[PDB]
Structures are given as C-alpha cells and as structure tokens.
Design a protein around this ligand. Structure first.
Ligand SMILES: CN1CCN(C(=O)[C@H]2CCc3c([nH]c4c(C(N)=O)cc(F)c(N5CCC[C@@H](N6CCN(C)C6=O)C5)c34)C2)CC1
Ligand SMILES: [Cl-]
Length: 270
C-alpha cells in the first residue's frame, strides 16, 4: 500500500498525471496511487545514486513518521530506472515559494515556516538521524502552506563528484559550518548551522546567502568570523535565534529542542 503493507509499490497502481520538473536524481512526476491518492514519483536516473545502500537505508526511513517530514511511501525497484514514491506537496519547494512575491507573507507566516522545519529536525535529532543537506531547496510546501523537510539523509547516496567534494560546484558550501568545510566534521551541530541559514533564507524571502561572495570566498570568510546580516523582516529576537546556530564552536550551538523552544517563545508573544 501507501505507507501501509508492502513498501515495494506496484507501478501498475500508479497513474502519471503531470511532470513536476527535474531534481538531483532526474525526473519527478505527480501522479495518483490506485486512482485516488496523490503521490510524487521520483525517477532515479541511472548512475546518479548508490541504489543498494539507499534501498537498505529506506527501511530506516520508512520507520520515521512525523507530520512535518515528507513521508516516504515506498519504492519501485523491479524496473529501470527505480522509482521513489513520496507524499505529494502541491506548492513545491520552499525556496521557489518564498521567492513568489505575490504571497505577500506576514512575518507570522515566516516564523511558522521556521517552526514546521524545526519540529521535523527536533524529531530527526531525537532519532539520531542527520539530515546532512538542510536548506530551503530541500523543504516542500503542501496545499495548506505547511512546510515539510524532504530528502533527509539522501546526500549519502549521491554519486555526483561535484556535490560530494567540499570544494565541488554543487556542495552546499553556504549551508556548512567551518568544521565541515575545513575537516569534514559532520554532526547534529552541522545540521544546526544549516537550520540557521535556512531561517535566514526564509526571512530574506529566498535570497541566496552570501550572494556577493563566491563559494571559496564564503568558506574563507565564515571561518574567519563573517556572519549573515539580519534580514529586514527579522526582529532582533528572531535574528538572535538564527545567529545562535552559527557559533564558531559547535558545542556552543543549541540543540533543535532548544531552538524550537526559542521559536515558540517568540510565537507566544503575538
Ligand atoms: C500548476 N500546479 C501544478 C504544479 N505546481 C508546483 O508548484 C509543483 C512544483 C514542483 C514540485 C511540486 N511537488 C514536488 C514534490 C512533491 N513531493 O510533491 C517533489 C519535488 F521534488 C518537486 N520538485 C521537482 C523539480 C525540482 C524542484 N522544483 C523546481 C521548481 N519548483 C517549484 C520545485 O519545487 C522540486 C515538486 C509541485 C503548481 C500548481
Ligand atoms: Cl533582507
């Protein structure tokens, strides 16, 4: 079924309805399962992912369950290419959504976007599960405007060298703490740093972080102490939250449990 029963999904139950575009692994489609339930269908371009390791990890991913996590429904592996079937998010990726100026977001909405993501990351942290590529491009938005974290942990199976090398052109340099860029030290605290950059993206309505700097200049400057400026839409109290994620010492960065509590404190003042 879809989240029930076998997680090997029979592709004969799928109807393709619309092309959603292409992402890290190629073609993504919108469709229906057994004519009724909406799904997204990720078709995994051959040569782009470490499929055996992913399919093993998919067992772990099926056991994760949180409202603010894009649900993995299952896989279609008896065919070329394989398919990954997930929850459908009608409003697309958070980054594009932020950049659509027609929404005319209130800051109350932006704050709740941060809360949705932080809830999902608190859940993952309680499960000792790192995201490893948290960013607005990796969050999705459903028809109710709820933001959900997607593709958690998937960077471990990407085969593209430009994404894997810390100096590759596709590595998430602008979402990485210094200990990642200099030593490849990943931890919950590198996810924390990325969450700070994500809050900044949200309150900047989707601007690219450190836009005036190249990837190399960014890596050098944040390791010296350059930090992202406060976005105009972020109050001092909101900026303190995102800023706290960027401490130069990883153990001085908060947990996601603390960040959620800080976000709720600001929310509760409204
Ligand atoms: C006209 N109507 C039908 C479709 N509409 C959308 O907005 C769709 C945008 C993409 C998208 C939607 N869902 C998803 C899901 C999902 N699990 O649901 C997973 C994905 F992995 C998506 N993407 C693939 C390409 C690259 C990237 N991109 C590239 C550009 N973009 C916005 C984006 O998200 C992400 C989408 C909804 C508008 C309303
Ligand atoms: Cl700004």
């Amino acid at each position: 079924g879809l989240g029930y029963g076998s997680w090997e999904i029979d592709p004969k139950d799928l109807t393709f309805l619309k092309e959603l575009g292409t992402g890290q692994f190629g073609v993504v489609k919108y469709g229906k399962w057994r004519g009724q339930y909406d799904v997204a269908i990720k078709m995994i371009k051959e040569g782009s992912m470490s499929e055996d390791e992913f399919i093993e990890e998919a067992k772990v991913m099926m056991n994760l369950s949180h409202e603010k996590l894009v649900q993995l429904y299952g896989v279609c592996t008896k065919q070329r290419p394989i398919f990954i079937i997930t929850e459908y998010m009608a409003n697309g990726c958070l980054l594009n959504y932020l950049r659509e100026m027609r929404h005319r977001f209130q800051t109350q909405q932006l704050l709740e976007m941060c809360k949705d993501v932080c809830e999902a990351m608190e859940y993952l942290e309680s499960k000792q599960f790192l995201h490893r590529d948290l960013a607005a491009r990796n969050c999705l938005v459903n028809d109710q405007g709820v933001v959900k974290v997607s593709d958690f942990g998937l960077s471990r199976y990407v085969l593209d060298d430009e994404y894997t090398s810390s100096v590759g052109s596709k590595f998430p340099v602008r979402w990485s703490p210094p200990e990642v860029l200099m030593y490849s030290k990943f931890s919950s605290k590198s996810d924390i740093w990325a969450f700070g950059v994500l809050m900044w993206e949200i309150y900047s309505l989707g601007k690219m972080p450190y836009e005036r700097f190249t990837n190399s200049e960014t890596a050098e400057h944040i390791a010296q102490g350059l930090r992202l400026y406060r976005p105009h839409l972020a109050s001092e109290k909101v900026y303190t939250i995102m800023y706290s994620c960027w401490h130069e010492k990883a153990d001085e960065r908060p947990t996601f449990k603390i960040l959620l509590s800080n976000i709720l404190d600001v929310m509760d003042e409204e």
